[PDB]
């Protein structure tokens, strides 16, 4: 309690001594409340005019148009302490999993240089505004790095002064850049050195890319076993227990010297004890604390979510196989059986999973998994939209399974080669591309964001008739040489000025380990679509009058956007499609 957080709290009080007050009408039950002070402030979604002018049929589709308009009663909840048998299963599995992840990797500190190049290339690091304007400016200024040193030496001393969360089923906890640096220094290696790559972690998909996920699910399908299970957790981040935070901290056991002390401090002082500042309109700043739940940087969060999810799912698999009888208490022979299971088949059981943070797909040994619920419920990883003790409903076809907001189709090319392609409801794809984040976008910057969406569609969703046509139209409407941009940046092979047919060949043929025949594709017409009926099932407007007028008159929409942007060098990509090829 207050010895670890007091200094952070004491320091905040003094900068707002002309406001402090212990309010007695504070809404917090599960968050420890400390005091309040005076403020007054709020970022809504803006429409991308280049994308919207080139997708006119969707102007009358509510699922698209509503996306551009616009629970914290889940953050103020508590999770019970697991039983002793559950805690033992988790500690033993966590110990074994950090060992496996560490067999071919070396933990190491990330550097001011690595951090500097990150901010100078626009990764969403979740910092705040204040003494410097942007993150770009603070990084080129030794004043900052002296503040970072003060905090750093404080951490080595086992104390914290300035590592405070700012709160804003989504809730994102910004820290000042300096705090983000010390987190990145201690734990950035997990992401930077690909600890959750498939090659290293066997369940993981970190860095795989949306063009590999479908092939990965198909490889899991090839295993002998039961249905494929894809149970979502109800508010994963709010269900992370202090016991989970302590099993995650065991990664420091693989570390040494300075690194071990810096990493232990981030875990102790910022994760297992948190200080948070929240806005309350009643507008005061509430300074609140708690020990449990997830509040890290979004990238360390991804890695620790993958870790703890892998652990939970192996334990659920153990329960389905009857490795242990009861979560109440693990016998001594049951611990030995859990350890022997992990040594004998642990790696085979990891390869039956695809896990991305809180998202998973498991192909267990058989369907006893469906009703193995006691450990999963007692760890607090309660399934979304199903009664606590109702058995999971599995999928019989890998092309039906949901994963990372997608499903995957098997698509046979005119030459017999097999593509496994990602897909989702087309209203979701068009609706997202019509949205921009932030203020002060020039027309040029708005056009270059539209071009990023268009190139993503050409690479990933080429098999959707409407998206190949709209992607070609947007690339025709934006100057040929203008570089695709994004303000928050899986692999992103569409972020290039190289010709998209050449990128398609590299991604889908040359570098695709599931394609034996490396014969390049010579034109877009060699690259197939979904069946017309499947395309309509996944949201295509093919067959509608509005869509036929749009397609036929597309050069008029292209010329409207060219006229707005002005006298520039443009390319006509529309003859890359059969129907416009004369
Ligand atoms: C663009 C281009 N597309 N084509 C093309 C592609 C496939 C078949 C046919 N007949 C033509 C070109 O010759 C140039
Ligand atoms: Zn600190
Ligand atoms: Zn689909």
340: closest CA among 309, 362, 318, 361? 318
* Residues in CB range of 361: below 8 A, 6 or more apart: 217, 220, 228, 229, 230, 353, 354, 355, 401, 403
Give the whole-angstrom CA distance, residue 392 versus residue 385. 11
* Binding residue numbers: 151, 155, 160, 163, 170, 232-233, 235-237, 305, 358-359, 384, 407, 409, 423, 538
**Per-residue b or e along 170-208, where b marks 16 or more CB atoms closer than 10 Å to that residue's CB:** ebebbbbbbbbbbbbbbbbbbbeebbbebebbbbbbbeb
How far does residue 536's CA lie from ligand 3's centre (Å)? Answer: 9
- First-residue to last-residue Cα distance in the chain: 74
Please provide the size of the chain in residues: 582
Domains in the chain: ranges and CATH: 1-38+111-187+241-292 (3.30.70.2840), 51-55+403-576 (no CATH), 81-103+197-237+296-401 (3.30.70.270)
Give the whole-angstrom CA distance, residue 394 versus residue 368. 11
Extract the tokens encoding 469.
């046509």
**Per-residue b or e along 29-50, where b marks 16 or more CB atoms closer than 10 Å to that residue's CB:** eebebbbbbeeeeeeeeeebbb
Crossing angle, helix 465-477 and helix 443-460, to 10 degrees?
A: 150
**Is any atom of ligand 1 closer than 6 Å to the C-beta of 525?**
yes
Give the whole-angstrom CA distance, residue 373 versus residue 127. 39
Give the whole-angstrom CA distance, residue 531 versus residue 468. 14
Distances from the Cα of 77 to the Cαs of 261, 269, 271, 278, 357, in angstroms?
32, 22, 17, 16, 21
Ligand 1 atom index nearest CA of 575: 1
How far does residue 201's CA lie from ligand 3's centre (Å)? Answer: 29
Query: Could you tell me the sign of the dihedral formed by the alpha carbons of 466, 472, 476, 482, in that order?
Result: positive
**Is any atom of ligand 1 closer than 6 Å to the C-beta of 576?**
yes
178: closest CA among 201, 157, 208, 155? 155
Q: Whose CA is nearest to atom 8 of ligand 1?
A: 525
Q: Is 477 exposed, middle or buried (0-12, 13-18, 19+ CB in 10 A)?
A: buried
SS3 217: helix
* Binding residue numbers for CTP: 170, 235-237, 305, 384
Q: Do 44 and 435 meet the contact criterion of CB atoms below 8 Å apart?
A: no
265: closest CA among 389, 201, 176, 182? 182
Extract the tokens encoding 491.
């692999």
Query: Could you tell me the sign of the dihedral formed by the alpha carbons of 79, 188, 503, 456, in that order?
Result: positive
**Is any atom of ligand 1 closer than 6 Å to the C-beta of 575?**
yes
Query: Could you tell me the sign of the dihedral formed by the alpha carbons of 181, 186, 191, 194, in that order?
Result: positive
Query: Could you tell me the sign of the dihedral formed by the alpha carbons of 311, 315, 317, 318, in that order?
Result: positive
Extract the tokens encoding 441.
């976008």
How far does residue 264's CA lie from ligand 2's centre (Å)? Answer: 12
Q: Residue 207's beta-bridge partner residues?
A: none
- Could you give phi then psi for residue 157, rounded to 5 degrees? -85, -10
* Residues in CB range of 261: below 8 A, 6 or more apart: 155, 156
Nearest ligand to the CA atom of 4: 2
Crossing angle, helix 242-249 and helix 298-320, to 10 degrees?
A: 100
Give the whole-angstrom CA distance, residue 91 versus residue 84. 11
């Amino acid at each position: 309690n207050l010895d670890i957080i007091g200094k952070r709290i004491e320091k905040i009080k003094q900068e707002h001594e002309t406001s402090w007050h212990y309010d007695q009408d504070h809404p917090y039950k599960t968050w420890a409340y400390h005091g309040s002070y005076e403020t007054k402030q709020t970022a809504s979604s803006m429409v991308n005019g280049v994308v919207r002018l080139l997708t006119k049929p969707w102007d009358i589709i509510p699922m698209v148009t509503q996306m551009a308009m616009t629970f914290k009663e889940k953050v103020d909840t508590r999770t019970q302490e697991p039983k002793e048998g559950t805690k033992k299963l988790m500690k033993i599995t966590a110990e074994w999993l950090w060992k496996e992840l560490g067999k071919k990797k070396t933990p190491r500190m990330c550097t001011r240089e690595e951090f500097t190049r990150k901010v100078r290339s626009n990764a969403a690091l979740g910092a705040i505004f204040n003494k410097w304007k942007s993150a770009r400016e603070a990084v080129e200024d030794s004043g900052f790095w002296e503040l970072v040193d003060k905090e750093r030496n404080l951490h080595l001393e086992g104390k914290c002064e300035t590592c405070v969360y700012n709160m804003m089923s989504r809730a994102i906890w910004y820290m000042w850049l300096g705090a983000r640096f010390l987190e990145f220094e201690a734990l950035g290696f997990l992401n930077e050195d690909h600890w959750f790559s498939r090659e290293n972690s066997l369940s993981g998909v970190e860095g795989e890319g949306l063009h590999k996920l479908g092939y990965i699910l198909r490889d899991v399908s090839k295993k002998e076993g039961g249905a494929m299970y894809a149970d979502d957790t109800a508010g994963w981040d709010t269900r992370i227990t202090l016991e989970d935070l302590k099993n995650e901290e065991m990664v420091t056991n693989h570390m040494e010297g300075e690194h071990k002390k810096l990493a232990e401090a981030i875990f102790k002082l910022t994760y297992q004890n948190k200080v948070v500042r929240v806005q309350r309109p009643t507008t005061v700043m509430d300074i609140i604390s708690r020990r449990d739940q997830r509040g890290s940087g979004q990238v360390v969060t991804y890695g620790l979510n993958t870790f703890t999810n892998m652990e939970a799912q192996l334990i659920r698999q153990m329960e389905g196989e009857g490795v242990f009888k009861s979560i109440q208490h693990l016998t001594v022979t049951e611990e030995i059986a859990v350890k022997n299971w992990l040594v004998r088949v642990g790696r085979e059981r990891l390869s039956r999973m695809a896990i991305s943070g809180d998202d998973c797909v498991v192909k267990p040994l058989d369907d006893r998994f469906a009703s193995a619920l006691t450990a999963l419920n007692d760890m607090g990883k309660v399934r979304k939209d199903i009664q606590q003790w109702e058995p999971s409903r599995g999928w019989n076809d890998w092309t039906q399974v949901p994963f990372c907001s997608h499903h995957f189709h098997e698509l046979i090319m005119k030459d017999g080669r097999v593509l496994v392609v990602p897909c989702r409801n087309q209203d979701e794809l068009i609706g997202r591309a019509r949205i921009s984040q932030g203020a002060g976008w020039s027309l040029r910057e708005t056009a270059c964001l539209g071009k990023s969406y268009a190139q993503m569609w050409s690479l990933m969703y080429f098999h959707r008739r409407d998206l190949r046509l709209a992607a070609n139209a947007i690339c025709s409407a934006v100057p040929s040489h203008w570089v695709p941009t994004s303000r928050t940046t899986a692999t992103h092979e569409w972020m290039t000025t190289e010709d998209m047919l050449t990128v398609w060949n590299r991604v889908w043929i040359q570098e695709n380990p599931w394609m034996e025949d490396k014969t390049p594709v010579e034109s877009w017409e060699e690259i197939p679509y979904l069946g017309k009926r499947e395309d309509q099932w996944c949201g295509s407007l093919i067959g509608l009058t509005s869509r036929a007028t749009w397609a036929k008159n597309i050069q008029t929409a292209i010329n409207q956007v060219r006229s707005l942007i002005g006298n520039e060098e443009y390319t006509d990509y529309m003859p890359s499609m059969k129907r416009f090829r004369r």
